[PDB]
Amino acid sequence: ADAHKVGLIPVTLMVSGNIMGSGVFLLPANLASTGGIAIYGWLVTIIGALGLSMVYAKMSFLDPSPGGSYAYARRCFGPFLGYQTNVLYWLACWIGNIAMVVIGVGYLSYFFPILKDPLVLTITCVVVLWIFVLLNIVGPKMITRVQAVATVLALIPIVGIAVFGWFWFRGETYMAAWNVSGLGTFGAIQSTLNVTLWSFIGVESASVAAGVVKNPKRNVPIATIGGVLIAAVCYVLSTTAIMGMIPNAALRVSASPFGDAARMALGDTAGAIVSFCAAAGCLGSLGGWTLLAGQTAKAAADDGLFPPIFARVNKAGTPVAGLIIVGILMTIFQLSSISPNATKEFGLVSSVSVIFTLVPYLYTCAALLLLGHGHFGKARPAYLAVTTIAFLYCIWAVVGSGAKEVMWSFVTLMVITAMYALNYNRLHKNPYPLDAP
Amino acid sequence: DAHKVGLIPVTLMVSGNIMGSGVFLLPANLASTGGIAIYGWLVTIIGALGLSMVYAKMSFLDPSPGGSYAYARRCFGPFLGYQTNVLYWLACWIGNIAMVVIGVGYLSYFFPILKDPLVLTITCVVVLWIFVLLNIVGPKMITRVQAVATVLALIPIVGIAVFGWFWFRGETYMAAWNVSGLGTFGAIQSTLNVTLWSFIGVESASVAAGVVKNPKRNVPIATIGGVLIAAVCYVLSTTAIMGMIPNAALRVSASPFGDAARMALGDTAGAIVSFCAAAGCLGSLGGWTLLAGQTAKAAADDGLFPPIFARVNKAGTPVAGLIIVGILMTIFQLSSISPNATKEFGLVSSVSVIFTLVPYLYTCAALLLLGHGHFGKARPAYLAVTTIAFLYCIWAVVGSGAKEVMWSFVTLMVITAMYALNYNRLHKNPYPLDAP
Ligand SMILES: CCCCCCCCCO[C@@H]1O[C@H](CO)[C@@H](O)[C@H](O)[C@H]1O
Ligand SMILES: CCCCCCCCCO[C@@H]1O[C@H](CO)[C@@H](O)[C@H](O)[C@H]1O
Ligand SMILES: CCCCCCCCCO[C@@H]1O[C@H](CO)[C@@H](O)[C@H](O)[C@H]1O
Ligand SMILES: CCCCCCCCCC
Ligand SMILES: CCCCCCCCCC
Ligand SMILES: CCCCCCCC
Ligand SMILES: CCCCCC
Ligand SMILES: CCCCCC
Ligand SMILES: CCCCCC
Ligand SMILES: CCCCCC
Ligand SMILES: CCCCCC
Ligand SMILES: CCCCCC
């Protein structure tokens, strides 16, 4: 077993790369419609996200079980909520890969503009998705080595700006666009949170991958907190720097603010470097999220809470069949990129599936308290405060989401309940059974 | 069985809790679609009958006090028990606000000062406490009162559904077959958006099983009988009215039974209809308050709700829990003091209606997960009926407003946080961690 485990550095880079992914290069454009007051939103977000990372760090320290959220939910609420957690999270992992491959290949269209035709884009995205399924089949050491390189590459423009763009930063420029939302202070913060709360999806990555991590009781907590801290610093420093270097009006309209600012600062090679690095961050993220889909489904199947095919492994313990099934499913949904109307159709699916992840987060918070109270000792109030902050993070993210996406998430939970009952009656053990027939 | 409730009053509680305010307003709500609503009714009644059979069988297997709450606890454990009771308890007493406003509004036919929002609010508060006090007198009292109220409310509904056919004209009905502007499926969906919600209350006997005589026999009978009564009345009366009153008038009418009666057999007929419709709403207040008391008492008895809700007088009535519900309803009844206050409270009311479907969903799950050993050779029929019942619940949500469902989702999240923060160290885990 020990020979197929992933070390601390690649797992930390997988956390930070799964978090920062496609979004990091788009954040400044998204927050430009609010303005520099977004710094307040960032403060709230980073406190909530750190809180949630600490929950995952402590829960994984107490229980480094394969599958992360799934395992915790099963421990504290039982097989039905474990089943629910895995279905939601597995769906979120592979459905989110469609949007991500489209973005990463889109960045590559800077070099090969043929990649902007919907048909060529769709074929290319299917190819790339299978590349990252195949790298996962080679194994977790391969996929995390690939993602570690891709994540460092993607950090080049982000860290570059965060450290050196301050030489061009102007506070006059930042403050001239302090609040362009047309909203009062609370509304402007809310419009920020509508973006930023969703920027830390992936904080659970090491916890979910604990079955393939070396010394997980030590490394999953470090990688979780460290990955979140990398992302938080990168986010704040880079979005702040950009808003002080580029007038708000241009930032609003830019589809690639880092790349549009680079291509016009240090020349065309700079736009090239940025586009390449941003593609690398996206595509590496594909590898990591596919790994996580295979891992959640294997852990659930290993407990009899998902079809047995998802627990079938090769000699190294890789769920090869599960990874192939995810590849097929992603290929089918990837057809959505074939036209603008096809992509608009698939869009609601993508938006709903992002909400799915918050239920795993909510149950992990619950589980830390419900399972771990005997480990808090004198620090119990601290554990209660941090976990309450993490709960608020999750709830606030939903409060600010579109009503239609949350409604279809509600419906999905209902369908999962019916599926569990119809598929698992006579296998399910009841905490308070009726008397014998 | 000194304080236990007999079969007839329990059945009338089921039908009266279901029919309530809605029955007299259904034809006006369906008139915007037209007579094609008959298709929607057919779909709804199959689904509602399905759900009633699920409740009937589950209560037969386990006549536990609290109904849905007790079943969810049995099959999914304390957390989902906790969730089921919180949701259902909220739905019961929040739904009473809209209920009492409608009931007192019917009485405005006699006393027009009741349309002044201030007098309306004061009167509503008083009436809510009247029904809390009757529940404190006891379940035999509250169910006797609701039985009489429910028979009164049947007078106009059964009167039209039996004798309205002398005046029914198929021409009139078919002239407004489909006025929705939608194709057939869209028109059916516009119907379902109204009709699926018209069977809330099917669970009433199940939840009240702790106060019912011989509940293992009578709760199933009352569940299926209450639903059949409602279904017959719904279909007969809405169909009759649509064949008696031009669609245009049916649309603009705020009380189609009352407006049609007042202009059919005179002012005395309008007065009769208004009295009976008020009686039906108000009696419902008593039944839904009883159910709030019962679900909270059952959950508190298992340590899954604050213990004050399990405090009982010598008769076993949760007097303090009923008083707490009275207080909560009063505070929110303040919403009827102005049009703006009422619209503000409207989102809360719509949201809380969705809550009930989670108890339904879990009761469907519980029947399969707990009762599979009792199905025998008829396993397929169980599986089919329960599947119909699941679809009924999911479809109801699929057609609801997105904002209402979103805030229901948020409520589930809050409830999960509240459970974790209040029950850690008391909650026992199915797969615990090793000792520190
Ligand atoms: C992986 C699970 C994701 C489930 C997401 C379901 C999205 C449904 C798309 O909505 C469609 O259009 C309307 C809303 O836009 C609906 O009224 C209509 O019924 C539906 O067909
Ligand atoms: C009791 C189950 C349903 C009862 C049906 C009552 C009569 C059904 C009328 O049918 C429909 O009438 C429409 C208008 O005439 C036609 O457009 C449509 O084509 C026809 O099929
Ligand atoms: C226990 C019952 C659950 C309560 C449901 C609460 C609904 C609160 C919604 O707030 C209101 O509606 C808008 C969203 O719909 C908000 O944006 C706006 O600020 C406000 O006007
Ligand atoms: C041992 C494999 C070396 C990994 C190089 C791949 C980098 C991929 C950038 C997207
Ligand atoms: C046990 C005393 C019965 C009282 C019944 C009064 C019914 C009034 C409902 C309108
Ligand atoms: C070692 C192979 C990594 C290549 C992945 C790049 C995807 C285009
Ligand atoms: C040895 C360096 C590890 C640091 C992880 C953030
Ligand atoms: C119940 C479905 C009816 C369809 C009529 C065309
Ligand atoms: C016996 C008292 C009945 C009161 C009806 C509202
Ligand atoms: C025998 C009395 C039991 C009561 C349960 C609340
Ligand atoms: C919600 C009411 C609780 C009362 C506790 C004493
Ligand atoms: C027995 C009296 C109850 C009071 C609760 C507020």
Torsion of CA B41, B42, B47, B51, to 10 degrees: 80
Q: How far apart are CA B333 and CA B102, in angstroms?
A: 12
Cα–Cα distance list, B377 to A28, B367, B373, B382, B383 (Å) = 64, 16, 11, 10, 12
Of B361, B402, B419, Cβ closest to residue A403: B402
What is the spatial distance between Cα A146 and Cα A287, in angstroms, rounded to a whole number?
Answer: 8
CA-to-CA distance for B400 and B431, rounded, in angstroms?
38
Closest ligand 8 atom number to CA of residue B39: 1
- Nearest Cβ partner of B402 from A62, A75, A404? A404
Q: DSSP assignment, residue B138? A: -
Give me the amino acid identity at A56. Answer: Y
DSSP 8-state class, residue A183: S
Give the distance from CA A289 to its chain's centroid: 8
Which atom of ligand 4 sits closest to the CA of residue A283? 10
Q: What do you get for the CA distance between the two ends of chain A, in Å?
A: 46
- B30 within 8 A of B37, measured Cβ to Cβ: yes
Q: Which of A358, A383, A357 is nearest to A370 (CA)?
A: A383
The widest CA-to-CA distance across chain A, in whole angstroms, is 79
Residue B23: beta bridge partners? none
* Centroid of chain to Cα A98: 13
Q: How far apart are CA B386 and CA B238, in angstroms?
A: 28
Calculate the CA dihedral of residues B79, B82, B87, B92 and round it to 10 degrees: 160
Rounded-to-5 percentages of helix, strand, coil across chain B: 80, 0, 20
Nearest by Cα to A67 from A212, A259, A269, A237: A212
The response to whether A282 counts as a known ligand-binding position is no
Q: Nearest CA of chain B to the CA of A61: how many Å?
A: 12
Measured between alpha carbons, how far is A74 from B375 in angstroms, rounded to an integer? Answer: 28
Length of chain A: 437
Contact criterion met (CB < 8 Å) for B372 and A77: no
**Which of A370, A383, A386 best tests the B interface by mutation, with the highest count of B CBs <10 A?**
A370
Nearest to B106 by CA among B23, B163, B164: B23
Q: In 3D, which of A117, A368, A381 has the Cα closest to residue B416?
A: A368
Name the region of B6 (left: φ>0; alpha: ψ -120 to 50; beta: rest). beta
Q: Closest ligand 12 atom, CA of B308?
A: 5
| A124: nearest Cα among A144, A143, A107 | A107
**Cβ neighbours of residue B392 closer than 8 Å, sequence gap 6 or more:** B44, B47, B48, B50, B51, B196, B360
If we measure between CA atoms, which residue out of A49, A88, A52, A83 comes closest to residue A364?
A52
**Cβ-proximal residues to B401 (8 Å cutoff; 6+ apart), any chain:** A403, B350
Please judge whether A430 and B74 are an interchain contact, meaning their C-beta atoms are less than 8 angstroms apart: yes
Q: Rounded to a whole number, what is the largest CA-CA distance in chain B?
A: 80
| Planar angle of CA A92, B73, B436, nearest 5 degrees | 75
Nearest CA in chain B to A75: B431
Q: Which A residues 63-122 touch B at CB under 8 Å?
A: 63, 74-81
Ligand 12 mean position, distance from CA A352 (Å): 45
B332 neighbors B97 (Cβ within 8 angstroms) = yes
Mutate to test the pocket of ligand 6, among A127, A135, A277 (most ligand atoms within 8 A of CB): A135
- Contact B304/B418 with Cβ under 8 angstroms? no
Grouping H, G, I as helix, E, B as strand and the rest as coil, residue B263 is coil
What is the end-to-end Cα distance of chain B in Å, rounded?
Answer: 50
Q: Is A92 annotated as a binding residue?
A: yes
CB A387, CB A369: distance < 8 Å: yes
Taking only residues 259 to 288 of chain A, the set having a beta carbon closer than 8 angstroms to any beta carbon of chain B reads: none
Q: How far apart are CA B34 and CA B329, in angstroms?
A: 36
Residue whose CA is closest, atom 3 of ligand 12? Answer: B320
C-alpha to C-alpha distances, A55 to A203, A220, B11, nearest whole angstrom:
10, 12, 50
* B418 touching A (Cβ < 8 Å): no
CA B411 → CA B83, B201, B414, distances in Å? 10, 21, 5
Residue B324 Cβ inside 6 Å of ligand 11? The answer reads yes
Interface of B with A in 365-394 (CB under 8 A): 365, 368-374, 383, 386-387, 390, 393-394
State the residue for tokens 């329990």: B10
Closest-CA residue in chain A for B374?
A437
- Proximal ligand: closest to the CA of B87: 3
Q: How far is CA B43 from CA B37, B49, B101, B389, B396, in A?
A: 10, 10, 30, 11, 12
Distance CA B354, CA B313 (A): 33
Neighbours of B171 (CB within 10 A): 7
Q: Which residues are B5's β-sheet partners?
A: B212
Contact, A58 vs A207, CB < 8 A? no
User: Residue B320: CB within 6 Å of ligand 12?
Assistant: yes
Cα–Cα distance between A122 and A119 in angstroms, integer? Answer: 5
Contacts for A234-237: CB closer than 8 Å, 24+ residues apart:
A234/A16, A234/A20, A234/A24, A234/A155, A234/A158, A234/A159, A234/A162, A235/A20, A235/A24, A235/A27, A235/A42, A235/A46, A235/A196, A235/A199, A236/A39, A236/A42, A236/A46, A237/A161, A237/A162, A237/A163
Task: Give chain A's domain count.
Answer: 1
Q: How far is CA B26 from CA B34, B42, B94, B153, B234, in A?
A: 12, 15, 21, 14, 8
Q: How far apart are CA A226 and CA A13, in angstroms?
A: 9
Is B421's CB within 8 Å of A369's CB? Answer: yes
Sign of CA dihedral B298, B304, B305, B309: positive
Burial status of residue A249 (CB atoms within 10 A of its CB: 0-12, 13-18, 19 or more) = exposed
* Ligand found nearest the CA of A226: 7
- Long-range Cβ contacts of A173-176 (<8 Å, 24+ apart): A173/A243, A173/A244, A173/A245, A173/A246, A173/A247, A174/A36, A174/A240, A174/A243, A174/A244, A175/A36, A176/A247, A176/A248
B405, B424, B429: best mutation site toward chain A, by most A Cβ within 10 Å? B424
- Is A19 assigned to a binding site? yes
| B257, amino acid identity | F
Which residue does chain B place closest to A410, by CA atoms? Answer: B409
User: What whole-number distance in Å separates Cα of residue B226 and Cα of residue B156?
Assistant: 18
**Domain limits for position A257:** 1-437
| List of residues 6+ apart from A268 with CB closer than 8 A | none
Method: X-ray
